């Protein structure tokens, strides 16, 4: 049985031994990277009993940074269907499809990915879903896609660079709204592989806090990944 979660645009599927996360497919009858999908109809078709309308793609937290946050106890995700999310580090169009299905057709996700092979698979994914726009540019240079990106509501950030807070800082000074949202995934073994991860994460939170965000919460992704944090914070409010 499929219920919507506390987060709008996110659904869960419940059974006798399982509980899975899923999203509402914007292109029905199509899968992207080999993901299981469930067909459910709205009730009122007992004599037919055919699952016709709603197609739901199962969101995998072992391949998604954001889906590991939602099953971890993320209180808000700052995005609703019809918002504007800038995705920094869109690795081959895995999670950005689920984010596009969250924001719906009146929302638009702006994917940014410097690496060329993931850019190839990202554009070959992004041809179908029209609510994403892909940008193959270095995320450390925001004035190269300042023409292409309008003001957004949420910044998601999963980039494996040591100046991750600096990339977030320049992209938020050029694109995030007043009182915006930031969901950043921090990698301790990318930033400093010798210090304690608590100290690495505290230094990154302090860098955002001096970078004029307001850290609301931080939670670890540790039934799913190893030494990864998710900082959920607001911008100027």
């Amino acid at each position: 049985i499929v219920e919507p979660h506390r987060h709008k645009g996110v659904f869960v599927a419940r059974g006798g031994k399982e509980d899975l996360l899923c999203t509402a497919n914007l292109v029905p009858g199509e899968s992207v990277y080999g993901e299981k999908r469930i067909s459910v109809e709205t009730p009122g078709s007992g004599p037919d009993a055919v699952a016709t309308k709603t197609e739901y793609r199962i969101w995998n937290p072992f391949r998604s940074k954001l889906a590991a946050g939602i099953l971890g106890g993320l209180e808000t995700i700052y995005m609703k269907p019809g918002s504007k999310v800038l995705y920094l580090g869109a690795a081959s169009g895995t999670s950005v499809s689920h984010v596009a299905d969250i924001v719906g057709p009146t929302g638009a996700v702006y994917a940014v990915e410097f690496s060329h092979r993931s850019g190839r698979d990202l554009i070959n994914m992004a041809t179908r879903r029209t609510n994403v726009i892909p940008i193959v540019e270095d995320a450390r240079k925001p004035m190269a896609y300042r023409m292409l990106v309008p003001m957004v509501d949420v910044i998601f950030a999963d980039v494996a660079q040591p100046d991750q807070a600096r990339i977030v800082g320049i992209n938020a000074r050029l694109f995030l709204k007043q009182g915006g949202g930031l969901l950043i995934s921090i990698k301790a073994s990318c930033i400093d592989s010798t210090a304690p991860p608590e100290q690495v994460f505290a230094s990154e939170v302090q860098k955002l806090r001096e970078d004029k965000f307001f850290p609301k919460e931080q939670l670890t992704l540790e039934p799913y990944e190893r030494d990864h944090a998710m900082v959920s914070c607001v911008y100027l409010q």
Binding site: G16, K17, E18, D19, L20, P61, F62, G72, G73, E198, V205, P215, K216, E217, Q218, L219, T220, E222, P223, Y224
Partner: protein, 109 residues
């Protein structure tokens, strides 16, 4: 060795799927506040069997799959040591039945 390698690949795929399903079944979170007043207000707001059976079942399945993979990995390592012990020239690797470790420092010319 080829048979043990194929069975180990199958068993490793089963362990990965079962561990993913066990995690999906079942100082972690930190919330920041500006002050002791807001922390205490959020503390006021905080003041205001089926799963056990199926999770014990998946846990027993996970432990049996880990035992199977560890057994096949030990078998593949023992067969690689058998190859080293039966090589056409003097190759290091493995212990003798007396316990002394075989190590030849010659190079393969």
């Amino acid at each position: 060795l080829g048979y043990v390698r194929t069975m180990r690949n199958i068993a490793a795929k089963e362990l990965k799927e079962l561990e993913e399903r066990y995690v999906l079944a079942g100082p972690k979170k930190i919330v920041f506040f500006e002050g002791v007043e807001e922390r205490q207000q959020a503390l006021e707001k905080q003041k205001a069997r089926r799963k056990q059976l199926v999770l014990e079942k998946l846990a027993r399945k996970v432990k049996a799959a880990r035992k199977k993979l560890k057994a096949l990995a030990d078998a593949e390592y023992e067969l690689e040591l058998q190859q080293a012990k039966m090589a056409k020239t003097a190759t290091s690797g493995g212990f003798t039945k007396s316990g002394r470790r075989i190590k030849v420092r010659e190079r393969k010319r």
